[PDB]
PDB file of C-alpha atoms and ligand atoms in Angstrom:
ATOM      1  CA  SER A   2     109.823  52.665 129.937  1.00  0.00           C
ATOM      2  CA  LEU A   3     106.364  52.632 128.330  1.00  0.00           C
ATOM      3  CA  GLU A   4     106.063  55.501 130.517  1.00  0.00           C
ATOM      4  CA  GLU A   5     108.642  57.382 129.279  1.00  0.00           C
ATOM      5  CA  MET A   6     107.559  57.056 125.455  1.00  0.00           C
ATOM      6  CA  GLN A   7     103.835  57.390 126.387  1.00  0.00           C
ATOM      7  CA  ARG A   8     104.409  61.080 128.407  1.00  0.00           C
ATOM      8  CA  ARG A   9     106.839  61.417 125.360  1.00  0.00           C
ATOM      9  CA  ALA A  10     103.949  61.420 122.642  1.00  0.00           C
ATOM     10  CA  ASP A  11     101.687  63.175 124.510  1.00  0.00           C
ATOM     11  CA  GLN A  12     103.810  66.016 124.642  1.00  0.00           C
ATOM     12  CA  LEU A  13     104.104  66.241 121.117  1.00  0.00           C
ATOM     13  CA  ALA A  14     100.793  65.799 120.244  1.00  0.00           C
ATOM     14  CA  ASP A  15      99.733  68.303 122.657  1.00  0.00           C
ATOM     15  CA  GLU A  16     102.558  69.804 120.557  1.00  0.00           C
ATOM     16  CA  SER A  17     100.805  69.546 117.120  1.00  0.00           C
ATOM     17  CA  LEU A  18      97.813  70.640 118.401  1.00  0.00           C
ATOM     18  CA  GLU A  19      99.527  74.048 119.288  1.00  0.00           C
ATOM     19  CA  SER A  20     101.081  74.106 116.052  1.00  0.00           C
ATOM     20  CA  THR A  21      97.631  74.002 113.940  1.00  0.00           C
ATOM     21  CA  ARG A  22      95.741  76.538 116.342  1.00  0.00           C
ATOM     22  CA  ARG A  23      98.717  78.580 115.373  1.00  0.00           C
ATOM     23  CA  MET A  24      98.604  77.537 111.183  1.00  0.00           C
ATOM     24  CA  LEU A  25      95.071  78.874 111.707  1.00  0.00           C
ATOM     25  CA  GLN A  26      95.668  82.214 113.464  1.00  0.00           C
ATOM     26  CA  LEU A  27      98.637  83.144 110.924  1.00  0.00           C
ATOM     27  CA  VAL A  28      96.164  81.903 107.632  1.00  0.00           C
ATOM     28  CA  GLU A  29      94.053  84.255 108.964  1.00  0.00           C
ATOM     29  CA  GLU A  30      95.671  87.169 109.049  1.00  0.00           C
ATOM     30  CA  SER A  31      97.139  86.670 105.951  1.00  0.00           C
ATOM     31  CA  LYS A  32      93.741  86.668 104.762  1.00  0.00           C
ATOM     32  CA  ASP A  33      92.864  89.742 106.163  1.00  0.00           C
ATOM     33  CA  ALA A  34      96.265  90.990 104.937  1.00  0.00           C
ATOM     34  CA  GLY A  35      95.276  90.175 101.447  1.00  0.00           C
ATOM     35  CA  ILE A  36      91.760  91.610 101.173  1.00  0.00           C
ATOM     36  CA  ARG A  37      93.489  94.914 102.439  1.00  0.00           C
ATOM     37  CA  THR A  38      95.817  94.688  99.748  1.00  0.00           C
ATOM     38  CA  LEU A  39      92.813  93.626  96.774  1.00  0.00           C
ATOM     39  CA  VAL A  40      91.255  96.587  98.628  1.00  0.00           C
ATOM     40  CA  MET A  41      94.191  99.180  98.155  1.00  0.00           C
ATOM     41  CA  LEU A  42      95.389  98.321  94.468  1.00  0.00           C
ATOM     42  CA  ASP A  43      91.504  99.012  93.580  1.00  0.00           C
ATOM     43  CA  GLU A  44      91.839 102.766  95.093  1.00  0.00           C
ATOM     44  CA  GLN A  45      95.209 102.901  93.877  1.00  0.00           C
ATOM     45  CA  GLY A  46      94.043 101.720  90.315  1.00  0.00           C
ATOM     46  CA  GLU A  47      91.324 104.204  90.031  1.00  0.00           C
ATOM     47  CA  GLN A  48      94.210 107.209  91.359  1.00  0.00           C
ATOM     48  CA  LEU A  49      95.588 105.749  88.298  1.00  0.00           C
ATOM     49  CA  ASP A  50      93.002 106.514  85.658  1.00  0.00           C
ATOM     50  CA  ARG A  51      92.610 109.844  86.888  1.00  0.00           C
ATOM     51  CA  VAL A  52      95.997 110.175  86.802  1.00  0.00           C
ATOM     52  CA  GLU A  53      96.036 109.131  83.401  1.00  0.00           C
ATOM     53  CA  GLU A  54      92.797 110.822  82.111  1.00  0.00           C
ATOM     54  CA  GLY A  55      94.475 114.057  83.652  1.00  0.00           C
ATOM     55  CA  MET A  56      97.787 113.354  80.751  1.00  0.00           C
ATOM     56  CA  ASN A  57      95.151 112.902  78.319  1.00  0.00           C
ATOM     57  CA  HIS A  58      93.695 116.716  79.423  1.00  0.00           C
ATOM     58  CA  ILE A  59      97.239 117.900  79.552  1.00  0.00           C
ATOM     59  CA  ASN A  60      97.850 116.699  75.830  1.00  0.00           C
ATOM     60  CA  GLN A  61      95.040 118.146  74.809  1.00  0.00           C
ATOM     61  CA  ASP A  62      95.405 121.563  76.022  1.00  0.00           C
ATOM     62  CA  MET A  63      98.954 121.630  74.446  1.00  0.00           C
ATOM     63  CA  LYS A  64      97.559 121.194  70.984  1.00  0.00           C
ATOM     64  CA  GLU A  65      96.004 124.217  71.549  1.00  0.00           C
ATOM     65  CA  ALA A  66      98.682 125.804  73.091  1.00  0.00           C
ATOM     66  CA  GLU A  67     100.947 125.095  70.022  1.00  0.00           C
ATOM     67  CA  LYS A  68      97.994 126.025  67.630  1.00  0.00           C
ATOM     68  CA  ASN A  69      97.952 129.304  69.682  1.00  0.00           C
ATOM     69  CA  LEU A  70     101.595 129.798  69.464  1.00  0.00           C
ATOM     70  CA  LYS A  71     101.946 129.157  65.743  1.00  0.00           C
ATOM     71  CA  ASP A  72      99.521 131.612  65.057  1.00  0.00           C
ATOM     72  CA  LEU A  73     101.702 134.518  66.380  1.00  0.00           C
TER      73      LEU A  73
ATOM     74  CA  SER B   2      96.565  60.933 108.048  1.00  0.00           C
ATOM     75  CA  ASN B   3      99.409  62.391 105.513  1.00  0.00           C
ATOM     76  CA  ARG B   4      96.711  61.943 103.027  1.00  0.00           C
ATOM     77  CA  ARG B   5      95.615  65.506 103.944  1.00  0.00           C
ATOM     78  CA  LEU B   6      98.871  66.833 105.497  1.00  0.00           C
ATOM     79  CA  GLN B   7     100.744  66.426 102.680  1.00  0.00           C
ATOM     80  CA  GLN B   8      97.939  67.663 100.337  1.00  0.00           C
ATOM     81  CA  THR B   9      97.699  71.119 102.793  1.00  0.00           C
ATOM     82  CA  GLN B  10     101.500  71.319 102.507  1.00  0.00           C
ATOM     83  CA  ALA B  11     101.141  71.001  99.006  1.00  0.00           C
ATOM     84  CA  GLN B  12      99.013  73.528  97.987  1.00  0.00           C
ATOM     85  CA  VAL B  13     100.935  75.990 100.749  1.00  0.00           C
ATOM     86  CA  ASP B  14     103.956  75.641  98.780  1.00  0.00           C
ATOM     87  CA  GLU B  15     102.230  76.740  95.387  1.00  0.00           C
ATOM     88  CA  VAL B  16     100.859  80.000  96.919  1.00  0.00           C
ATOM     89  CA  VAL B  17     104.407  80.675  97.806  1.00  0.00           C
ATOM     90  CA  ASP B  18     105.575  80.241  94.675  1.00  0.00           C
ATOM     91  CA  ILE B  19     102.968  82.165  93.675  1.00  0.00           C
ATOM     92  CA  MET B  20     103.345  84.950  96.262  1.00  0.00           C
ATOM     93  CA  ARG B  21     107.121  85.381  95.485  1.00  0.00           C
ATOM     94  CA  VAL B  22     106.313  86.420  92.205  1.00  0.00           C
ATOM     95  CA  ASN B  23     103.812  88.830  93.138  1.00  0.00           C
ATOM     96  CA  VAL B  24     106.426  90.155  95.735  1.00  0.00           C
ATOM     97  CA  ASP B  25     108.618  90.606  92.503  1.00  0.00           C
ATOM     98  CA  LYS B  26     106.184  92.211  90.687  1.00  0.00           C
ATOM     99  CA  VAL B  27     104.722  94.970  93.657  1.00  0.00           C
ATOM    100  CA  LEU B  28     108.698  95.428  93.816  1.00  0.00           C
ATOM    101  CA  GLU B  29     108.710  96.632  89.756  1.00  0.00           C
ATOM    102  CA  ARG B  30     105.660  98.658  90.460  1.00  0.00           C
ATOM    103  CA  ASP B  31     107.575 100.106  93.503  1.00  0.00           C
ATOM    104  CA  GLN B  32     110.605 101.520  90.896  1.00  0.00           C
ATOM    105  CA  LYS B  33     108.391 102.489  88.181  1.00  0.00           C
ATOM    106  CA  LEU B  34     105.938 104.510  90.661  1.00  0.00           C
ATOM    107  CA  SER B  35     109.147 105.736  92.033  1.00  0.00           C
ATOM    108  CA  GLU B  36     110.291 106.989  88.681  1.00  0.00           C
ATOM    109  CA  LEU B  37     106.863 108.327  88.223  1.00  0.00           C
ATOM    110  CA  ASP B  38     106.610 110.239  91.383  1.00  0.00           C
ATOM    111  CA  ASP B  39     109.670 111.741  89.884  1.00  0.00           C
ATOM    112  CA  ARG B  40     107.857 112.688  86.533  1.00  0.00           C
ATOM    113  CA  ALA B  41     104.865 114.193  88.209  1.00  0.00           C
ATOM    114  CA  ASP B  42     106.383 116.501  90.346  1.00  0.00           C
ATOM    115  CA  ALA B  43     108.729 118.053  87.381  1.00  0.00           C
ATOM    116  CA  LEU B  44     105.774 117.767  85.054  1.00  0.00           C
ATOM    117  CA  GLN B  45     103.842 120.639  88.207  1.00  0.00           C
ATOM    118  CA  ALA B  46     107.322 122.592  88.606  1.00  0.00           C
ATOM    119  CA  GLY B  47     107.402 123.033  84.347  1.00  0.00           C
ATOM    120  CA  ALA B  48     103.266 123.382  84.102  1.00  0.00           C
ATOM    121  CA  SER B  49     104.042 126.076  86.949  1.00  0.00           C
ATOM    122  CA  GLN B  50     106.248 128.129  84.751  1.00  0.00           C
ATOM    123  CA  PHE B  51     104.569 127.527  81.306  1.00  0.00           C
ATOM    124  CA  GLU B  52     101.816 129.108  83.098  1.00  0.00           C
ATOM    125  CA  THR B  53     103.476 132.214  84.266  1.00  0.00           C
ATOM    126  CA  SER B  54     105.246 132.924  80.720  1.00  0.00           C
ATOM    127  CA  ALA B  55     101.685 132.581  79.189  1.00  0.00           C
ATOM    128  CA  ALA B  56     100.686 134.935  81.954  1.00  0.00           C
ATOM    129  CA  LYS B  57     103.021 137.428  80.201  1.00  0.00           C
ATOM    130  CA  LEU B  58     102.607 136.861  76.773  1.00  0.00           C
ATOM    131  CA  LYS B  59      98.816 138.030  76.877  1.00  0.00           C
ATOM    132  CA  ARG B  60      99.767 140.841  78.731  1.00  0.00           C
ATOM    133  CA  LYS B  61     102.716 141.382  76.283  1.00  0.00           C
ATOM    134  CA  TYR B  62      99.999 140.987  73.071  1.00  0.00           C
ATOM    135  CA  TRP B  63      96.776 142.167  75.105  1.00  0.00           C
ATOM    136  CA  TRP B  64      94.907 142.619  71.845  1.00  0.00           C
ATOM    137  CA  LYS B  65      95.043 139.040  71.141  1.00  0.00           C
ATOM    138  CA  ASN B  66      92.116 136.825  72.192  1.00  0.00           C
TER     139      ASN B  66
ATOM    140  CA  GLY C   1      88.015  61.326 117.885  1.00  0.00           C
ATOM    141  CA  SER C   2      88.835  63.261 121.459  1.00  0.00           C
ATOM    142  CA  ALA C   3      87.954  66.541 121.917  1.00  0.00           C
ATOM    143  CA  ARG C   4      91.207  67.629 120.765  1.00  0.00           C
ATOM    144  CA  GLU C   5      91.716  65.042 118.569  1.00  0.00           C
ATOM    145  CA  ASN C   6      89.084  66.387 116.545  1.00  0.00           C
ATOM    146  CA  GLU C   7      90.374  70.469 116.979  1.00  0.00           C
ATOM    147  CA  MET C   8      93.324  69.010 115.517  1.00  0.00           C
ATOM    148  CA  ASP C   9      91.633  67.498 112.042  1.00  0.00           C
ATOM    149  CA  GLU C  10      89.011  70.192 111.881  1.00  0.00           C
ATOM    150  CA  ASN C  11      91.967  73.189 112.304  1.00  0.00           C
ATOM    151  CA  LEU C  12      93.691  71.129 109.160  1.00  0.00           C
ATOM    152  CA  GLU C  13      90.550  71.184 107.432  1.00  0.00           C
ATOM    153  CA  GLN C  14      89.947  75.091 108.049  1.00  0.00           C
ATOM    154  CA  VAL C  15      93.518  75.791 107.389  1.00  0.00           C
ATOM    155  CA  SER C  16      93.241  74.193 103.833  1.00  0.00           C
ATOM    156  CA  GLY C  17      90.388  75.914 103.093  1.00  0.00           C
ATOM    157  CA  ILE C  18      91.485  79.373 103.697  1.00  0.00           C
ATOM    158  CA  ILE C  19      94.870  78.309 101.993  1.00  0.00           C
ATOM    159  CA  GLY C  20      92.371  78.122  99.076  1.00  0.00           C
ATOM    160  CA  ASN C  21      91.238  81.494  99.292  1.00  0.00           C
ATOM    161  CA  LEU C  22      94.382  83.175  99.632  1.00  0.00           C
ATOM    162  CA  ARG C  23      95.673  81.535  96.092  1.00  0.00           C
ATOM    163  CA  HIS C  24      92.644  82.880  94.887  1.00  0.00           C
ATOM    164  CA  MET C  25      93.792  86.042  95.918  1.00  0.00           C
ATOM    165  CA  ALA C  26      97.074  85.776  95.208  1.00  0.00           C
ATOM    166  CA  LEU C  27      96.470  85.069  91.618  1.00  0.00           C
ATOM    167  CA  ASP C  28      94.324  88.410  91.521  1.00  0.00           C
ATOM    168  CA  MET C  29      96.888  90.820  92.948  1.00  0.00           C
ATOM    169  CA  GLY C  30      99.440  89.538  90.248  1.00  0.00           C
ATOM    170  CA  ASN C  31      96.912  89.904  87.661  1.00  0.00           C
ATOM    171  CA  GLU C  32      95.934  93.408  89.451  1.00  0.00           C
ATOM    172  CA  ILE C  33      99.665  94.313  89.407  1.00  0.00           C
ATOM    173  CA  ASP C  34     100.507  92.943  86.322  1.00  0.00           C
ATOM    174  CA  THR C  35      97.723  95.508  84.248  1.00  0.00           C
ATOM    175  CA  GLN C  36      99.009  98.259  86.268  1.00  0.00           C
ATOM    176  CA  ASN C  37     102.245  97.999  85.502  1.00  0.00           C
ATOM    177  CA  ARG C  38     101.376  98.429  82.031  1.00  0.00           C
ATOM    178  CA  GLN C  39      99.099 101.256  82.939  1.00  0.00           C
ATOM    179  CA  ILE C  40     101.935 102.967  84.741  1.00  0.00           C
ATOM    180  CA  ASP C  41     103.992 102.715  81.848  1.00  0.00           C
ATOM    181  CA  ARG C  42     101.450 104.245  79.343  1.00  0.00           C
ATOM    182  CA  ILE C  43     101.237 106.984  81.795  1.00  0.00           C
ATOM    183  CA  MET C  44     104.801 107.706  81.886  1.00  0.00           C
ATOM    184  CA  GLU C  45     105.414 107.891  78.478  1.00  0.00           C
ATOM    185  CA  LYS C  46     102.163 110.227  78.181  1.00  0.00           C
ATOM    186  CA  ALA C  47     103.884 112.255  80.674  1.00  0.00           C
ATOM    187  CA  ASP C  48     107.023 112.357  78.911  1.00  0.00           C
ATOM    188  CA  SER C  49     105.522 113.432  75.757  1.00  0.00           C
ATOM    189  CA  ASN C  50     103.635 116.165  78.073  1.00  0.00           C
ATOM    190  CA  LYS C  51     106.598 117.379  79.610  1.00  0.00           C
ATOM    191  CA  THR C  52     108.363 118.141  76.333  1.00  0.00           C
ATOM    192  CA  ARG C  53     105.516 119.846  74.754  1.00  0.00           C
ATOM    193  CA  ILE C  54     105.628 122.075  78.133  1.00  0.00           C
ATOM    194  CA  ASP C  55     109.330 122.277  78.220  1.00  0.00           C
ATOM    195  CA  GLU C  56     109.133 123.789  74.675  1.00  0.00           C
ATOM    196  CA  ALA C  57     106.100 125.711  74.288  1.00  0.00           C
ATOM    197  CA  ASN C  58     107.798 126.952  77.423  1.00  0.00           C
ATOM    198  CA  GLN C  59     110.870 128.402  74.790  1.00  0.00           C
ATOM    199  CA  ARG C  60     108.935 129.826  72.704  1.00  0.00           C
ATOM    200  CA  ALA C  61     106.745 131.328  74.706  1.00  0.00           C
ATOM    201  CA  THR C  62     109.940 132.925  76.611  1.00  0.00           C
ATOM    202  CA  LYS C  63     111.375 134.187  72.962  1.00  0.00           C
ATOM    203  CA  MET C  64     108.126 136.219  72.122  1.00  0.00           C
ATOM    204  CA  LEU C  65     108.682 138.030  75.226  1.00  0.00           C
ATOM    205  CA  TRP C  66     111.766 139.680  74.362  1.00  0.00           C
TER     206      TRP C  66
ATOM    207  CA  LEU D   4     106.115  57.330 118.748  1.00  0.00           C
ATOM    208  CA  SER D   5     107.964  57.059 115.220  1.00  0.00           C
ATOM    209  CA  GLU D   6     104.260  57.716 113.648  1.00  0.00           C
ATOM    210  CA  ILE D   7     104.025  60.454 116.374  1.00  0.00           C
ATOM    211  CA  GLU D   8     107.506  61.615 115.874  1.00  0.00           C
ATOM    212  CA  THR D   9     107.840  61.900 112.417  1.00  0.00           C
ATOM    213  CA  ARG D  10     103.960  63.414 111.414  1.00  0.00           C
ATOM    214  CA  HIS D  11     104.618  66.249 113.991  1.00  0.00           C
ATOM    215  CA  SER D  12     107.910  67.087 112.116  1.00  0.00           C
ATOM    216  CA  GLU D  13     105.371  67.234 108.993  1.00  0.00           C
ATOM    217  CA  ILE D  14     102.924  69.711 110.941  1.00  0.00           C
ATOM    218  CA  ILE D  15     105.911  71.704 112.134  1.00  0.00           C
ATOM    219  CA  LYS D  16     107.128  71.702 108.410  1.00  0.00           C
ATOM    220  CA  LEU D  17     103.872  72.847 107.658  1.00  0.00           C
ATOM    221  CA  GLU D  18     103.427  75.189 110.018  1.00  0.00           C
ATOM    222  CA  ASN D  19     106.804  76.430 108.861  1.00  0.00           C
ATOM    223  CA  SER D  20     105.470  77.163 105.525  1.00  0.00           C
ATOM    224  CA  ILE D  21     103.081  78.877 106.753  1.00  0.00           C
ATOM    225  CA  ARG D  22     104.876  81.032 108.802  1.00  0.00           C
ATOM    226  CA  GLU D  23     106.695  82.271 105.428  1.00  0.00           C
ATOM    227  CA  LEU D  24     103.250  82.565 103.373  1.00  0.00           C
ATOM    228  CA  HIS D  25     102.068  84.975 106.168  1.00  0.00           C
ATOM    229  CA  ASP D  26     105.100  87.034 105.732  1.00  0.00           C
ATOM    230  CA  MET D  27     104.329  87.742 102.183  1.00  0.00           C
ATOM    231  CA  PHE D  28     101.092  88.795 102.358  1.00  0.00           C
ATOM    232  CA  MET D  29     102.112  91.097 105.239  1.00  0.00           C
ATOM    233  CA  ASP D  30     105.066  92.833 103.298  1.00  0.00           C
ATOM    234  CA  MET D  31     102.684  92.752 100.014  1.00  0.00           C
ATOM    235  CA  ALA D  32     100.419  94.690 102.020  1.00  0.00           C
ATOM    236  CA  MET D  33     102.731  96.870 103.519  1.00  0.00           C
ATOM    237  CA  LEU D  34     104.730  97.874  99.849  1.00  0.00           C
ATOM    238  CA  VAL D  35     100.998  98.570  98.641  1.00  0.00           C
ATOM    239  CA  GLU D  36      99.898 100.876 101.588  1.00  0.00           C
ATOM    240  CA  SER D  37     103.677 102.363 100.738  1.00  0.00           C
ATOM    241  CA  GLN D  38     103.591 102.470  97.375  1.00  0.00           C
ATOM    242  CA  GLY D  39     100.069 104.500  97.691  1.00  0.00           C
ATOM    243  CA  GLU D  40     102.150 107.231  99.261  1.00  0.00           C
ATOM    244  CA  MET D  41     103.704 107.968  96.058  1.00  0.00           C
ATOM    245  CA  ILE D  42     100.462 107.806  94.048  1.00  0.00           C
ATOM    246  CA  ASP D  43      98.741 110.574  95.770  1.00  0.00           C
ATOM    247  CA  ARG D  44     101.238 113.000  95.472  1.00  0.00           C
ATOM    248  CA  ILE D  45     101.466 111.936  92.236  1.00  0.00           C
ATOM    249  CA  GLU D  46      97.952 112.420  91.589  1.00  0.00           C
ATOM    250  CA  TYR D  47      98.266 115.686  93.602  1.00  0.00           C
ATOM    251  CA  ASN D  48     101.402 117.132  91.398  1.00  0.00           C
ATOM    252  CA  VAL D  49      99.229 115.937  87.916  1.00  0.00           C
ATOM    253  CA  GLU D  50      95.622 117.579  89.346  1.00  0.00           C
ATOM    254  CA  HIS D  51      98.475 120.876  89.396  1.00  0.00           C
ATOM    255  CA  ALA D  52     100.078 120.416  86.416  1.00  0.00           C
ATOM    256  CA  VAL D  53      96.568 120.360  85.094  1.00  0.00           C
ATOM    257  CA  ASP D  54      95.472 123.105  85.831  1.00  0.00           C
ATOM    258  CA  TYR D  55      98.489 125.240  85.392  1.00  0.00           C
ATOM    259  CA  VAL D  56      97.924 124.136  81.784  1.00  0.00           C
ATOM    260  CA  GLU D  57      94.546 124.749  81.602  1.00  0.00           C
ATOM    261  CA  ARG D  58      95.094 128.175  82.831  1.00  0.00           C
ATOM    262  CA  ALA D  59      97.538 128.942  80.336  1.00  0.00           C
ATOM    263  CA  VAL D  60      95.911 128.140  77.228  1.00  0.00           C
ATOM    264  CA  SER D  61      92.433 129.360  78.856  1.00  0.00           C
ATOM    265  CA  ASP D  62      92.780 133.528  77.996  1.00  0.00           C
TER     266      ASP D  62
ATOM    267  CA  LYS E   9     121.384 139.997  80.772  1.00  0.00           C
ATOM    268  CA  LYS E  10     119.779 139.483  84.217  1.00  0.00           C
ATOM    269  CA  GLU E  11     117.653 137.113  82.243  1.00  0.00           C
ATOM    270  CA  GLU E  12     120.379 134.512  82.001  1.00  0.00           C
ATOM    271  CA  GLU E  13     120.980 134.953  85.457  1.00  0.00           C
ATOM    272  CA  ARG E  14     117.599 133.381  86.074  1.00  0.00           C
ATOM    273  CA  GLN E  15     117.751 130.294  83.917  1.00  0.00           C
ATOM    274  CA  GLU E  16     120.478 129.258  86.083  1.00  0.00           C
ATOM    275  CA  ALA E  17     118.093 129.797  89.271  1.00  0.00           C
ATOM    276  CA  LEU E  18     116.166 127.079  87.325  1.00  0.00           C
ATOM    277  CA  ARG E  19     118.790 124.695  85.727  1.00  0.00           C
ATOM    278  CA  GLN E  20     119.826 124.547  89.417  1.00  0.00           C
ATOM    279  CA  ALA E  21     116.814 124.096  91.082  1.00  0.00           C
ATOM    280  CA  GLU E  22     115.991 121.314  89.000  1.00  0.00           C
ATOM    281  CA  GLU E  23     119.493 119.904  89.811  1.00  0.00           C
ATOM    282  CA  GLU E  24     118.429 120.029  93.437  1.00  0.00           C
ATOM    283  CA  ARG E  25     114.605 119.003  92.617  1.00  0.00           C
ATOM    284  CA  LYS E  26     116.371 115.864  90.822  1.00  0.00           C
ATOM    285  CA  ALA E  27     119.029 115.525  93.856  1.00  0.00           C
ATOM    286  CA  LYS E  28     116.106 115.113  96.415  1.00  0.00           C
ATOM    287  CA  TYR E  29     114.303 112.363  93.785  1.00  0.00           C
ATOM    288  CA  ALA E  30     117.527 110.322  93.907  1.00  0.00           C
ATOM    289  CA  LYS E  31     117.992 110.631  96.897  1.00  0.00           C
ATOM    290  CA  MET E  32     114.374 108.862  97.577  1.00  0.00           C
ATOM    291  CA  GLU E  33     115.130 106.617  95.334  1.00  0.00           C
ATOM    292  CA  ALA E  34     118.343 105.112  96.913  1.00  0.00           C
ATOM    293  CA  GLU E  35     115.955 104.802  99.882  1.00  0.00           C
ATOM    294  CA  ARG E  36     113.494 103.108  98.388  1.00  0.00           C
ATOM    295  CA  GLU E  37     116.015 100.345  96.727  1.00  0.00           C
ATOM    296  CA  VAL E  38     117.465  99.674 100.017  1.00  0.00           C
ATOM    297  CA  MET E  39     114.269  98.586 101.100  1.00  0.00           C
ATOM    298  CA  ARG E  40     113.439  96.685  98.194  1.00  0.00           C
ATOM    299  CA  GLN E  41     116.428  94.866  98.122  1.00  0.00           C
ATOM    300  CA  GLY E  42     115.979  93.767 101.508  1.00  0.00           C
ATOM    301  CA  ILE E  43     113.084  92.050 101.262  1.00  0.00           C
ATOM    302  CA  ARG E  44     114.838  90.354  97.781  1.00  0.00           C
ATOM    303  CA  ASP E  45     117.308  88.930 100.145  1.00  0.00           C
ATOM    304  CA  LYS E  46     114.477  88.028 102.264  1.00  0.00           C
ATOM    305  CA  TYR E  47     112.691  85.583  99.863  1.00  0.00           C
ATOM    306  CA  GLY E  48     115.455  84.968  97.154  1.00  0.00           C
ATOM    307  CA  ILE E  49     115.131  87.155  94.441  1.00  0.00           C
TER     308      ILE E  49
HETATM  309 MG1  LIG F 101      92.104  99.852  87.115  1.00  0.00          MG
HETATM  310 MG1  LIG F 102     107.205 119.873  93.799  1.00  0.00          MG
END
């Protein structure tokens, strides 16, 4: 049955190699997805600053409306 | 050997732990953004109305700069 | 040391290498998410302050149109 | 065959762990792209809010 | 007079603007929970 055991160890060795090939592919997409995520966080972070800058302007302008409004 | 396999497995469980935390943080980001999207939309609606009131007010007190 | 016995080794060596990059990105990710989460909070308190002044300047504004 | 029997399980155990990490990286990216939809609706509304207010006090 | 009829228009329009954003939020939370289960959170 050495024949049997051998044909068995070969099958499991072939599958272990197959597994590492998939691991590589999986880890590659992950890296790809990760880089894509860091890029969108950057792009969105800039959007957030522009939004915050807009809140600051609105704040400044409302003081003027308040100043004007009172002066009536 | 396992001298490298167990090492690799270990460094995977860590990146998994770190990412599950990150996923928890982006879900907070998700809720905050959802709230801000509501707030900024009300804000645009409220500013729009204020601009119409001001326009009327300026016509009413047309001698005021 | 076979053609495929080496593929098994190199595949793993490369996987472990890439996992190192992933770890580094997972750390940037979270630090960026945190910074931004605080900024989104600050931005909502600001929007809340602005909303109020606008809801109020509007009342006064409207009362004078009578 | 024993060393081969177990080592193989280890190998798959690792792959499965990697399937999970892959999952999270993919979902994280989907989430940030999704959240980006809200962010430019927010940026759009604030941009108009800014302009409506500038007009309100700039006569 | 005919002005209060407007404040009504406005108040009801906001109850609706807020309704449309409350439905959006629930739909987001469902996906958030889905992701939560998926990873144990
Ligand atoms: Mg930034
Ligand atoms: Mg709107």
